[PDB]
Amino acid sequence: PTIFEERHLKYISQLGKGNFGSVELCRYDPLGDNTGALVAVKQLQHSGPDQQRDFQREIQILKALHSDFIVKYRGVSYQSLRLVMEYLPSGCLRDFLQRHRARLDASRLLLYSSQICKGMEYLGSRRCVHRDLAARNILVESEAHVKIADFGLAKLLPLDKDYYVVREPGQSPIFWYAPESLSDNIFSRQSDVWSFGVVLYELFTYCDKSCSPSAEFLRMMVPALSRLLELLEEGQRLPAPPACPAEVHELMKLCWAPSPQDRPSFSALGPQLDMLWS
Ligand SMILES: CCNC(=O)c1ccc(Nc2cc(-c3c(F)cccc3Cl)nc3c2C(=O)N=C3)nc1
């Protein structure tokens, strides 16, 4: 049922590529008449023991998450393990905003914000920290529906602790990380809230490259990690997006509070986003 036969997974193309893994577009087609469903299939390529263990955790995490705003686990395929997910043909939200900017207004962006928030609220209820919340990792289900994706760096909190310390820092872009993550490798639901603030910045700049998080931080900026951390600890933040409502920018600034304790929860952000302009 949730076991997918290798021989019926017809490869079409690559969707994304990583250093130790890749995501491929396939049609699972048992009948062989091209009528079967399209699926996104993740697999490791020449990985080490550490990456295989993480991949086993990722599979079980995603398998247990049930939300309308999180990409759906479909099953597995077995020498080498493969993770089968639903396929969302509209692609990631970053490319979508850039491509369809003229068609999408501020109310649509707030709809996406609300749905991402609800997904993250649900993730926090499962004691799960995403660690890589960004517009590139949000998928478009339809023009009025987005889902959080890419659980490769996701980790569950310890049962009796609200934070997690990463030993070996995974090389993802520094401009979505909270201060404590950069300084001390501390991750939590509150560090995800920081990243959500950057997602709101991404949405309301329509993921424009010229004014991206990196581009704008680099303008404000001896090492790059040490300079970014120095800048944030002085209180310097990303600017208001030009086409952003005042109240939305105020919520971004609360998401970026220096102390994790002073940042609002996704449960407190949700109603604030939904009640805007009513
Ligand atoms: C014609 C151009 N087509 C696309 O540009 C396209 C279409 C669909 C697409 N979908 C993705 C993409 C990813 C993905 C990745 F491949 C690398 C890094 C991060 C993510 Cl979220 N993951 C999943 C999916 C999916 O449907 N289910 C899981 N991605 C790209």
UniProtKB/Swiss-Prot annotation:
The effect of Y87F is: About 40% loss of STAT5a activation
Summarize the PTM comment: Tyrosine phosphorylated in response to IL-2 and IL-4. Dephosphorylation of Tyr-163 and Tyr-164 by PTPN2 negatively regulates cytokine-mediated signaling.
* Phosphotyrosine, modified sites: Y87, Y122, Y163, Y164
Q: In which tissues is this gene expressed?
A: In NK cells and an NK-like cell line but not in resting T-cells or in other tissues. The S-form is more commonly seen in hematopoietic lines, whereas the B-form is detected in cells both of hematopoietic and epithelial origins.
- Chain coiled-coil ranges: none
Disulfide-bonded cysteines:
none
The segment(s) forming the Protein kinase domain are 9-278
Q: What residues form the catalytic site here?
A: D132
Subcellular localization(s) per the UniProt record: Endomembrane system; Cytoplasm
- Name the positions where ATP binds: L15, G16, K17, G18, N19, F20, G21, S22, V23, K42
Q: What does this protein do?
A: Non-receptor tyrosine kinase involved in various processes such as cell growth, development, or differentiation. Mediates essential signaling events in both innate and adaptive immunity and plays a crucial role in hematopoiesis during T-cells development. In the cytoplasm, plays a pivotal role in signal transduction via its association with type I receptors sharing the common subunit gamma such as IL2R, IL4R, IL7R, IL9R, IL15R and IL21R.
Which family is it part of?
Answer: Belongs to the protein kinase superfamily. Tyr protein kinase family. JAK subfamily.
Implicated in which disease?
A: Severe combined immunodeficiency autosomal recessive T-cell-negative/B-cell-positive/NK-cell-negative: A form of severe combined immunodeficiency (SCID), a genetically and clinically heterogeneous group of rare congenital disorders characterized by impairment of both humoral and cell-mediated immunity, leukopenia, and low or absent antibody levels. Patients present in infancy recurrent, persistent infections by opportunistic organisms. The common characteristic of all types of SCID is absence of T-cell-mediated cellular immunity due to a defect in T-cell development.
Domain annotation text? Answer: Possesses two phosphotransferase domains. The second one probably contains the catalytic domain, while the presence of slight differences suggest a different role for domain 1.
Q: What is this protein called?
A: Tyrosine-protein kinase JAK3
